[PDB]
Amino acid sequence: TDYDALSCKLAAISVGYLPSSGLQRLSVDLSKKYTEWHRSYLITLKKFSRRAFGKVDKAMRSSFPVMNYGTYLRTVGIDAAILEFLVANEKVQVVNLGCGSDLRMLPLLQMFPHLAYVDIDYNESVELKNSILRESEILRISLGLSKEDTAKSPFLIDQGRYKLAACDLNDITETTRLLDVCTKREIPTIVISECLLCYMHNNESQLLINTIMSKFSHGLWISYDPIKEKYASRWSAAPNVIVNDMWEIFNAQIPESERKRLRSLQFLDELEELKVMQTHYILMKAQWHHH
């Protein structure tokens, strides 16, 4: 089901939905890299695991236009909130909780030179991600890694401004130990729980939100999950909380020439199948400021 995130992302790139140069703000150079980084991740997946390649290859090509619209709003909806925070603050650090197979750090590191980034998943999850980034040549050059495994402890990658690491997020001891050594308190901090909290119980997820919000002074928490007032309540300690289902993001945040561009690639005869599905997915932004 991390494979559902990667299969969706490759189905959107193949049709043309992503990369959107308007919303994500990617040049012709960085849009050529966005497509070549994901496709080099799929080809490298075939080497280390032919079963994992078989699930992602069959799901990508069998994805319908409805499912590709939901992936397009999933990517540019989160990215839009990231770009507002990375322009208002230049020295920023990220903590993508449940990162999985996400490669938004690759374009984000080139655009913002003073951007730290921290990826966190299970031991079985980041072991496969680490092998793919160290094997592919284009993914090696972008992160500035040599083929050697000079990294150390649970830190599978640790080359300057990017750091991959294994950690059970349910175990709060491993999570806070990890954030002490790799991040800083006062530095502005985006936390990204993309399709993560649906796997955890309400006890462990609420402890993860209270502890991470506490350990940083200034920050923004972009979340995304299946199910909106009940979901947004979890971050009530933060004084400013917006919350919106993905049908509301489709109308409000997606501008007019973007609507015509997606219609030109694959026309979605009826917007009803898109509304029913996307009202059951949402997107939460939560900005808190200590001092």
Ligand SMILES: Nc1ncnc2c1ncn2[C@@H]1O[C@H](CSCC[C@H](N)C(=O)O)[C@@H](O)[C@H]1O
């Ligand atoms: N307790 C836990 N500790 C660490 N990772 C977890 C976890 N529970 C779920 N995850 C991870 O959360 C991920 C959610 S799948 C979505 C992946 C990513 N957010 C994306 O959109 O591309 C999975 O890869 C899974 O391994």
